[PDB]
Amino acid sequence: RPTFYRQELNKTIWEVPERYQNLSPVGSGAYGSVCAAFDTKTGHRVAVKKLSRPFQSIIHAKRTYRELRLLKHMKHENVIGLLDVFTPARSLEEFNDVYLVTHLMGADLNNIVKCQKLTDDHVQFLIYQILRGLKYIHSADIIHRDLKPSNLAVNEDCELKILDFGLARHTDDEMTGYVATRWYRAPEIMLNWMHYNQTVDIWSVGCIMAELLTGRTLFPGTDHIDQLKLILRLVGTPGAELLKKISSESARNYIQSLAQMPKMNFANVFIGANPLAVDLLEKMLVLDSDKRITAAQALAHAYFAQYHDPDDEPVADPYDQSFESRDLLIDEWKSLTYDEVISFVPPP
Ligand SMILES: C/C(=N\Cc1cccnc1)c1ccc(Cl)cc1
Ligand SMILES: [Cl-]
Ligand SMILES: [Cl-]
Ligand SMILES: [Cl-]
Ligand SMILES: [Cl-]
Ligand SMILES: [Cl-]
Ligand SMILES: [Mg+2]
């Protein structure tokens, strides 16, 4: 067990191993507080996140367990990994607090799309890396569910990592009105049309790719209905085949109330783009999720010819998510989490 030291940073007690120095506040959502630190064992600048109220309800205890299981599994160059996890508790009986340690991310994709000039070569490399990371995530039957520019870290060498997996966190207030939290979501999840699957993440990649090519949000809806009208003007209204797959009768009645529209000409929307980029966007931005290109198929598309290496596009170890259907008490979720903290082995 390392030695721990205590300090108060903005109304919060932090108790951390001596290896982590020069802690300074960086942010705080409702899920925890974050400090930047220097990790003297590795020489990395790191983010230290202290969870807030991790075991306050069954829903909260299960979310804590879910986040720690996911972060411990993800071992890929284009996905955030877990550098460390610790608790100052010396036993299960005094266990209350969880701290997670990752590499400190500087810029996101929002800090390069808005304020920089991207060539076709930059777009090929950035989207290649997102798809390499997604092949790995999808091979574990994990859905990200929240891909958008603010969840993609990028360095000065244009190297990219996926972060901030959807832990089923987002509220109705957060998805209301003229908000980036909804502009990248697939229409079947935005409007609860049907049981969704991993194809939702490829819709989000299409929206991101379009925005790197034009410098403008593809579907900046003022609300759910405005955003659906923007989507159907580009891709066309649904045919009888997709309408049969929509489980809500009211959702089907509403769609049928709209005048029919054909798919637009993507070369006339993405004026001057690489024709191979236009072709790949037409294969991602398909309304019927069964017919979208997969991550593994997209890596083999001719747009990525200068980066594609089928011997360096790895898949994940198997991921057991059977806990998701399990009914447990707060203290049972808390014991499972404690075991995952004490069994952690750091990366090489
Ligand atoms: C960093 C980088 N390339 C590294 C690299 C070497 C060999 C194979 N694959 C990737 C890079 C930078 C800017 C643009 Cl626009 C594109 C790529
Ligand atoms: Cl230490
Ligand atoms: Cl990482
Ligand atoms: Cl504790
Ligand atoms: Cl964003
Ligand atoms: Cl597993
Ligand atoms: Mg985020």
Side-chain angles (χ1 to χ4, degrees), residues 121-122 125 157-158 307:
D121 287 315
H122 287 116
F125 186 49
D157 297 2
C158 208
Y307 299 106

Short mmCIF file of all heavy atoms in Angstrom, two decimals, residues 121-122 125 157-158 307, ligand 1:
data_model
loop_
_atom_site.label_atom_id
_atom_site.label_comp_id
_atom_site.label_asym_id
_atom_site.label_seq_id
_atom_site.Cartn_x
_atom_site.Cartn_y
_atom_site.Cartn_z
N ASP A 121 -6.08 15.23 -46.33
CA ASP A 121 -5.15 14.28 -45.68
C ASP A 121 -5.44 14.25 -44.17
O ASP A 121 -5.41 13.15 -43.59
CB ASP A 121 -3.68 14.62 -45.97
CG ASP A 121 -3.24 14.30 -47.39
OD1 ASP A 121 -3.56 13.20 -47.89
OD2 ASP A 121 -2.56 15.16 -47.98
N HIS A 122 -5.71 15.40 -43.55
CA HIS A 122 -6.05 15.47 -42.09
C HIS A 122 -7.38 14.72 -41.88
O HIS A 122 -7.48 13.93 -40.88
CB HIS A 122 -6.22 16.90 -41.57
CG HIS A 122 -4.95 17.66 -41.44
ND1 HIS A 122 -4.71 18.79 -42.20
CD2 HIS A 122 -3.86 17.50 -40.65
CE1 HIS A 122 -3.53 19.29 -41.88
NE2 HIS A 122 -2.99 18.52 -40.93
N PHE A 125 -6.90 10.94 -42.00
CA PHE A 125 -6.16 10.37 -40.84
C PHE A 125 -7.06 10.41 -39.59
O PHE A 125 -7.04 9.41 -38.76
CB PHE A 125 -4.82 11.09 -40.60
CG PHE A 125 -3.93 10.51 -39.53
CD1 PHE A 125 -3.64 9.16 -39.49
CD2 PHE A 125 -3.35 11.31 -38.58
CE1 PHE A 125 -2.81 8.63 -38.51
CE2 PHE A 125 -2.51 10.79 -37.60
CZ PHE A 125 -2.23 9.45 -37.59
N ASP A 157 0.48 16.19 -33.30
CA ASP A 157 0.77 15.23 -34.41
C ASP A 157 -0.55 14.63 -35.01
O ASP A 157 -0.43 13.64 -35.76
CB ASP A 157 1.67 14.11 -33.89
CG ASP A 157 3.05 14.58 -33.42
OD1 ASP A 157 3.30 15.80 -33.46
OD2 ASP A 157 3.85 13.74 -33.00
N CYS A 158 -1.73 15.17 -34.69
CA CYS A 158 -3.05 14.75 -35.28
C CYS A 158 -3.42 13.32 -34.82
O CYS A 158 -4.28 12.68 -35.51
CB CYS A 158 -2.96 14.73 -36.80
SG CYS A 158 -4.49 15.03 -37.71
N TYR A 307 -3.51 4.68 -45.22
CA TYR A 307 -3.36 4.30 -43.78
C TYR A 307 -3.75 2.86 -43.42
O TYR A 307 -3.21 2.32 -42.44
CB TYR A 307 -4.15 5.29 -42.91
CG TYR A 307 -3.69 6.72 -43.02
CD1 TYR A 307 -4.45 7.65 -43.71
CD2 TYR A 307 -2.47 7.11 -42.51
CE1 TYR A 307 -4.01 8.95 -43.87
CE2 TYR A 307 -2.01 8.41 -42.67
CZ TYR A 307 -2.78 9.33 -43.37
OH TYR A 307 -2.37 10.62 -43.58
C1 LIG B 1 1.18 11.90 -37.72
C2 LIG B 1 0.80 11.57 -38.97
N1 LIG B 1 1.20 10.37 -39.58
C3 LIG B 1 1.89 9.32 -38.85
C4 LIG B 1 1.86 8.03 -39.59
C5 LIG B 1 2.99 7.47 -40.20
C6 LIG B 1 2.86 6.28 -40.92
C7 LIG B 1 1.59 5.68 -41.01
N2 LIG B 1 0.47 6.20 -40.40
C8 LIG B 1 0.63 7.36 -39.70
C9 LIG B 1 -0.04 12.49 -39.78
C10 LIG B 1 -0.04 13.87 -39.49
C11 LIG B 1 -0.82 14.73 -40.22
C12 LIG B 1 -1.58 14.20 -41.24
CL1 LIG B 1 -2.49 15.28 -42.18
C13 LIG B 1 -1.62 12.87 -41.56
C14 LIG B 1 -0.84 11.99 -40.82
#
